[model samples]
Target chain A: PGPCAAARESERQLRLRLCVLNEILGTERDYVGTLRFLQSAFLHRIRQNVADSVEKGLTEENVKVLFSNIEDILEVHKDFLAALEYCLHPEPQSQHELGNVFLKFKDKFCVYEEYCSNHEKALRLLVELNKIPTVRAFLLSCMLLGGRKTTDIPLEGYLLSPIQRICKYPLLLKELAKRTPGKHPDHPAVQSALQAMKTVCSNINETKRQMEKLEALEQLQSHIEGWEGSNLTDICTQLLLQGTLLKISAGNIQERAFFLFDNLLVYCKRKSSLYIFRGRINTEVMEVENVEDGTADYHSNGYTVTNGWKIHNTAKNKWFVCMAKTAEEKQKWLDAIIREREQRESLKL
Target chain B: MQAIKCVVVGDVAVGKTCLLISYTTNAFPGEYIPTVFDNYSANVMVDGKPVNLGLWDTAGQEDYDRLRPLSYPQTDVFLICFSLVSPASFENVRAKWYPEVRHHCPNTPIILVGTKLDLRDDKDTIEKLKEKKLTPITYPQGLAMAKEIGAVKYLECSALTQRGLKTVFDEAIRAV
Candidate 1:
């Protein structure tokens, strides 16, 4: 048992690390499975909360994105936990080694990490959604009525736990190499796991920043008045669904609320409500091709503004551009449109 | 350009929505779709200027009596519409529409409109009215009702045949 003694000692350290990992995995498993129930169980209530918004029609889109993303992430991680549990205990009679388990998991770890990294974007939406008075009240009532105390808490904490769990990976593995030592065979695997967890955390942070801006955009949109004849939320719906950069239009102008989606932009102004004047615009998002856009001849004959973006339907080769606001706003408008146009051109081929 | 919010109020089946559908779209929707629209808005040249025109439609049945005036807060002008062929709907222009519009919008301008001008002079419609011991409301009678109710002007239109339809909305824009 010359080298067998060292091998046995390594196995002992592996067992300690495996015990910690198994606990994290089991907790994440429980967290992800319950959220699967939440996806169906709570969506109807969230949709009902749409009435709390000034424009219930527009509010529906964001609620869909907010919850669908939660379900998507949970579904992703649920599959992840199952594969991990299999690697930990695949059969009854076979002798298992920690180095081989990590080696087997290493191939699949990046895919799960990628999914885990998206937790923050989905988390940002849920956190902000929970803050809404109507949504919060509904969730609180969930706790009071049928909520399982130790079994299941209200959605606010329930949703937050999975989000918090993904970030704790690096923290959980950071000291593993120290425990294993350089002579230990599992030392390199410990370092790599820690490194992979750090990368996931960084990626998640980037997505979180974007989600924060999007949530702000959603709130800002609700403040403006909507226009009739325009499906004022179409562009917003597209942007929310795609998970990309979103900015409020300089509706930042003379009594206006302009919004940009992935492929379309909408304009709106405000009107009155009972307790206050709710800034609600109109709705007409489709079948609009009379749009006029271009730098010159904006003043001649058409829907032209001195400043702002111009849009045109090029399908008929009959087109126009609206106007864009500030210099930065102008670029943002062009970049979004150009991307759409470029893809449209590629799709034609 | 300045904005104008014009609200239409009257009894059900009196062509309030038909008048709006014809004006904004330049074509009648040809059939009722239940929820045609709660509000419709567009920009048009009132003379040489583009004006923002907001059109609000309220259900006239007793069910929406409490909910109808939700569109009245920012109204600049009110169009109390009545069907030219429906005597009961025409009667409500004075008894129901005028009082309701005035109560919610005390200082707002009111215009009396007689819709379905195409059907008023139709042979079958006139016969139907005669069978009910009623007759289509004539222009003079509409003018008299407008005067009695303190409406700014009496107007008429047909959504089906596009008769006097643009003028009704043009006058609405001008009134603002």
Candidate 2:
């Protein structure tokens, strides 16, 4: 009776594992099909039109920025999907060893990193491109193809499909690995495939973070009006923290916004909706001090400022006395500054 | 020494990388990472003055087409290049390359360049173009386009053979 029950349970588990594997294949088939449509329907036709008359209509440069290595991703995935099919095919008796297949394509996964990082700019470039009536007309015509016309998704949605697909690998692999039993022959390879995908996902995450940091800094650089220093991006290592803080000087208070970067502390005053670049302090020899409300220096500043902190640059022998509205805010400023200072000190020591 | 910034622009496979690498290292590169070669400089005597010629190589590929203009700002001179054996690439000088640089750097001087001089007269190269019913761009045609685009100088070179390569930079320095 126990032997018959165990056999029945194992059969059920096998069916579950097969179900997950088949879903992975089916989704992959659809993903590859979408990329193929992006290639033929959009990229190829756009290139053909450009070739017809580059100067008169949409130019090569426009095409290049909008597509941005999507073709490379398409070709790579086509091969990847082919390899995946071979591993899972041959019916119920198939070995189904997928780890080696994934490991083989590990280096090629970096192509996705490039596309994902550039994905933000590609959309923005597409919007700006519509200024040309010819481009707008062509794009609208392409969108009219599948589904009920009124409910159809735009071109941006299709362009973003590759990025959407890359992020999906981690979860799919995790699910597949869970359904696979430990003693099964596919178990180790499935586990390895999951781990490999997690590596790629993390790599993409870091690249995207760095790109975001750079973009934020560039945007800040544009908003600062009179910053006579080098490009804000060129000077700073990383933007650690930023907020509005009251500046205390000569017993006077003025509302100033501060930007705390790895190597420097920059503060700006707003004038007519734009930040005018005011001053900066190098944080390498920098120090942040908590000043009490009743202290002489804090009192000497005309207003009774609460939750006050001071930034001192040991190298420059100057201090920026500042105040935040709340203790929690002041504490956050102190924590970030002290953490930055300690980390740099440890690296040097 | 004063550094003269010269940006090289052209279509893909027009030898922009080869032109800079050969001029700087005197060694022709077999393969190159596309889009950017970063900043490479060579200290050379231009008219008895020691000038640091800063060569900025640009990607002709469409992948980086939008980001390429960042290098154009503060450019002292531009080397707008094309392949002597590529009529399509040469035509792009007026249609694509010239208009782009003009918009970004209206005042900067341009030195029109025809690259791959070694292949222009080669038997197999001519035959391959003949198959496509295209012929090599002539020196007079390149010179005419130089005038059409208001370029300061018209030059041709072969990075493989290092023929007329040194003069390209010499004239670039003089343009600034």
Candidate 3:
């Protein structure tokens, strides 16, 4: 009786398996036919979503959903890839139908990539999407529909683009003021858009600041290279020292300069407060500071002349201090120093 | 050199920014600054050749969906990060985020990264609560999801400890 019961159970299980397999095969055929329909529908939905996003203005809430949808599509592709891998090695020929599942996966991945690239391009184009009043109003509607974070208008995404454009091109401020909805400036959607725009402008400004700094550094390098002669070289050495001191004090010079100078010195110079001077006429020497009381004074000319009195007769006193009204005037003094040094070099010749 | 643009996507507080910072700056901040959209570029050497990596870190908030289409352009790699502590986050990875990424960037190489592996030792405390049979904590779900999606690879990492970071980039470069 027990043996009979076991055999009947086995038969029932086999029948169920066959039924499932048959059902799956039917589903597969339907899937292929429906796959095209679903693909087109899915693409259409995505397009609609993007259009809605642009027309209304994308809010943090909307973006969240969009990101979620994007992630879902990626998950689908991942599953499809898995299905493909699995179908590559099916146990039974009946299971070979699984291979077609991979086609759907491949299709989804292709569609997703295409859609994303297109959507990204669209958004980039709508760089001026916020410029449209209707688009701005729609964005605010979405934010209000989502929820208000604080009592204030959530103007991050809404006001961000227009405000940023105004900030970037100050001339556009009038244009922005004209487009901005004065009634609900504090609305969540408007706030979010404005915030996003602010972020973009700040980033651009930061890039500009970095570029300016780079240009200044390049100019400094060229200025340093133009120095000539023994006296001028001495002055240049002092000027370089002063500049280095100021840089180290202000934490401005690039570390690369130190590395290059270290290579020229052929010494693994220790990081120290001591300054080094290299003169064309005089021998290169290092000046060490006595930091016991932190009041040690080092004169550039080596001799201190009080009340304009000449201290050294044989040594040419080429160094003089002058106050300038502006940085350009200071630069003029630098140019004069350069000319004087060149004149002394020609005299030596 | 071609520009390689990559975006970090995951649940809130899942260390997406931390991972990017580690790779780009080799430094990580203790306090989190909610990033909306930050574009950074760094030169990296692969096989003794230099390549410019253009990285964009987007806000993890779901409300930022509309900005995604703008963010998805030229993305070579999509890193889906998650925290082991938050099963909801892991679920989001499987259900929402991954799908969204596919929707935007279908063929983009993806890497499933399970962050905060340093907390793995804390599984003992959860087991102590006498919850149903305690199984060894593993990142199998994340791995399974990665496998299901045809991800390049799935990895468990600890940004705090700098574990599995190199492997993540190695897989990305290999995929590229």
Candidate 4:
């Protein structure tokens, strides 16, 4: 009976040991499982949230929140990795058990490295996307819609406002971006608004250059007095306000200057009038006269009248009309022209 | 052409789907789909032998514990997945699920799978696992588990790259 009891106790101890080992193993396994689910959830949520924030006009605060989320996930990942490493190395007392633990941890470590690398790559992308000015602007724009006129406002203003807003409160946009359909790239309203803002700011530098030229021209004209010359030449020379040479006459200087000044004033006043359209003189008749000039019958005595001396205001009442036409055409072609210019500039660089 | 009934029984998120996907299709989905107590099956040929494996992928939710027994029946091979990085999963397998499954399918060959092996090199992760008393399994643990469960053979594998998957099946086939 003594021997039998000893054997029974030994068997019970063996069972107990197995149970203890199994319990430890089970707990370890559960940890891995839970960690995996949590990790997957963490990664998926981060990606979705980042995408949403980008769509909503992510702010610096949003980026900060995103980083915080990433850091939290990393902490969990670190815990998971540590648990796996321990599981791989068991006590040396049981060779079989020890071997099993070693192999299990080995496999886990390999998978963990892969996931970590992917996570790192995703984090880098998030950082880079946040740095983009356009992206920043879009994110900011989604937040605080007031403080300035969005319409007819310079693209830079629109972009800067949103970016500044995001910088001030990083995670606000990210939180908004994380909600369901709002995070998706295919969200129509978000996409359209972003596209429009992009178009507005895309050629801002070029627009600034054009504005500078206009300002310089205005300044030059303000300093000049009344002058007469071809309007195109005056605009090109940046001297519209300065008096321009109207006519050169060897016959009488005073008469010619007075005549030229009167004609110049009329030209300025009626520059856009279409009613005074002296229908284009027939060029064919002019060509005939040119042919006669070289012939023998072409005499100096023959009387010639030069209607070029007449002053007609043919361009009156057309300032606003011309401006409207040009503005519409400019909107249609401006984007294309800007793109071409940018491409050329890039090649030069 | 008999179907090999294989079930991936493990704690949640130990790359069960990843392993199945790698073995069946040699591809990993960009996203992870959580499994509730259900079985996913596929047929594939290994070593010129055509076999069908009914892979039971169970959810990690404690509430679904009752469904595990039902999922284990008729499973020829059980892949007990434990993340080497997460010792708690290994503990849960021993305390909760493994014993239950053993009662139902005592003779079923168990394949101990150590998932996320890449994290073993991380000093922080290694230290944490030690605190949890989860010994690093590595390749040695895989072989030892096979021997303990009376498995014909064992192998370490990654579902992301499908590394060592062929060997895992080869060992399972030998056992069968």
Instruction: Report the C-alpha lDDT of model 1 over A1-349, residue by residue, as the tens digit.
Output: 5789978876776665554555445555666656665664566455556564424222565555544456556655666666656656753111222333434444433443333334344445655766677665655554445444422323434444444454445544653444455766666766777666666555555554554455555555555443233343434434422111212222322343344454454444334411112222121222222223442343224333443443433444333334444455656655655665565457669
What digit string (tens of lDDT, one per residue) describes model 3 on residues B20-129? 77665544644332232234556667777766666655543333344344556557898888876656677788788888989878889998888877766775645653
Sorted on lDDT, best first, the list reads 2, 1, 3, 4
Docking quality category of candidate 1 according to DockQ thresholds: incorrect
Expressed as tens digits, the lDDT of each residue in A194-249 for candidate 2 is: 88877776777677767777787888878888877777678675789989988876
lDDT of 3 by residue, A75-164 (tens): 554465456446434432322333234223333433333333234334444445447777656544544444423232223322122211
Where model 1 places Cα greater than 4 Å from the true spot, the runs are A1-349, B26-35, B60-62
Over 4 Å off, model 3:
A1-349, B30-37, B123-137
lDDT of 4 by residue, A235-349 (tens): 2422212111122122211111111111122212112211121112111111111112122211222223121121122343111000112333333333332443355457669
Complex DockQ per candidate: 0.01, 0.01, 0.04, 0.01
Candidate 4's displacement at residue A284, Å, is 99
Off by over 4 Å in 2: A1-3, A51-66, A88-95, A121-136, A145-150, A182-184, A222-258, A267-279, A285-349, B1-176
Place model 3 in a CAPRI quality band.
Answer: incorrect
Best by DockQ: 3
Q: What's the distance in Å from true for residue A112, model 4?
A: 37
Provide the overall lDDT of each model, using Cα atoms, as 2-decimal numbers: 0.57, 0.75, 0.46, 0.42
How far residue A229's Cα lies from its native spot in candidate 4, in Å, is 99
The TM-scores that each candidate's chain B achieves against the reference are 0.92, 0.92, 0.82, 0.76
**lDDT of candidate 1 over B1-176, digit per residue (tens):** 57677777887677665566666663355422222333445677888998777676654222324334434655788888899999999888778878888887888888888988989879999998899899999999999999998888899888777788888878877887
* Maximum-lDDT candidate: 2
lDDT of 4 at A304: 31
